[PDB]
């Protein structure tokens, strides 16, 4: 790893027992099967600008 380039995570990174790493997302987001990407699960997720996202 989390120390190195955020463990490849788009949002949050947790280090585990060994060379194990779990990416996580802020509430209003879900982790994709790539285990790194965060996709919104709500209409207005935090830190996204609707008029820019809709353009």
């Amino acid at each position: 790893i989390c120390v190195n380039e955020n463990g490849g995570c788009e949002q949050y990174c947790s280090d585990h027992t060994g060379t194990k790493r779990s990416c996580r997302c802020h509430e209003g987001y879900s982790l994709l099967a790539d285990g790194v990407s965060c996709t919104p699960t709500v209409e207005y997720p935090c830190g996204k600008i609707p008029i820019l996202e809709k353009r």
């Binding site: 120390v3 209409e43 935090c46 609707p50």
Partner: protein, 254 residues
């Protein structure tokens, strides 16, 4: 904001305008539907605690366009370590009386995790600072929300790159410097409490709070911001707690 630009309407949707008796007091940041992060110093001279209003979806102070949502501030939470009239621990957590309704013009900014903020966000060079504060030192305040892109610097570098002034406050581990030393661009006294927002992989995060400086855009000086990463746990614990009677609450820190 000195040397910035108008934030196009809806592009700073987490920006809060705090009012006391209808008068501009400070800025703030919406972090979810009922919580706002501002600066503790904003509340040093408040006696009329029931006249404290937070406005979301605000852009132009001369017109009502219908996207503005105002809420009574039910609680102001300040760390026990903050001393009124001083600079250290300059943070406040505000609980709105009713939630705001999220729309295209009202969206919260992400309060990041501590580790992510220290290990990744602290190294993003540039971040945005915003408010309806002074357009110049000894100037008029803005009618439209202003935004400025500022670079972050390490405290050793901030101290050595700054003009040595007498009785000047220390830059603690609860602060960071951001901005320009050439006297052209800075946040200002009326921007206090406002967001210092950092972009990382398509998402914006709260990393700082407009706190203090020596004048506005003063040669040899940078803006000083509350280092939000130091308060993540303190903020999270409070958001999970039940409201308490009384507007002002002092909460133990750490």
């Amino acid at each position: 904001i000195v040397g910035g630009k108008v934030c196009p309407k809806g592009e700073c949707p987490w920006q809060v305008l705090l009012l006391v008796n209808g008068a501009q007091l400070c800025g703030g940041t919406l972090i979810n539907t009922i919580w706002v992060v501002s600066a503790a110093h904003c509340f040093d001279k408040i006696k009329n605690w029931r006249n404290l209003i937070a406005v979301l979806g605000e852009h132009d102070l001369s017109e009502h366009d219908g996207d503005e949502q105002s809420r009574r501030v039910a609680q102001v939470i300040i760390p026990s370590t903050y001393v009124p009239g001083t600079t250290n621990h300059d943070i406040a957590l505000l609980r709105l009386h009713q939630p705001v309704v999220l729309t295209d013009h009202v969206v919260p900014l992400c309060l990041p995790e501590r580790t992510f903020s220290e290990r990744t966000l602290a190294f993003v060079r540039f971040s945005l600072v915003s408010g309806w504060g002074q357009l110049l030192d000894r100037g008029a305040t803005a009618l439209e929300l202003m935004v400025l892109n500022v670079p972050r610097l390490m405290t050793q570098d901030c101290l050595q790159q700054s003009r040595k002034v007498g009785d000047s406050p220390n830059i603690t581990e609860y602060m960071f410097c951001a901005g320009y030393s050439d006297g052209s661009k800075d946040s200002c006294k009326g921007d206090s409490g406002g967001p210092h927002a950092t972009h990382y992989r398509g998402t914006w995060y709260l990393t700082g709070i407009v706190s203090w400086g020596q004048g506005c855009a003063t040669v040899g000086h940078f803006g000083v911001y509350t280092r939000v990463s130091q308060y993540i746990e303190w903020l999270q614990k409070l958001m999970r707690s039940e409201p308490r009677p009384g507007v002002l609450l002092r909460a133990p820190f750490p």
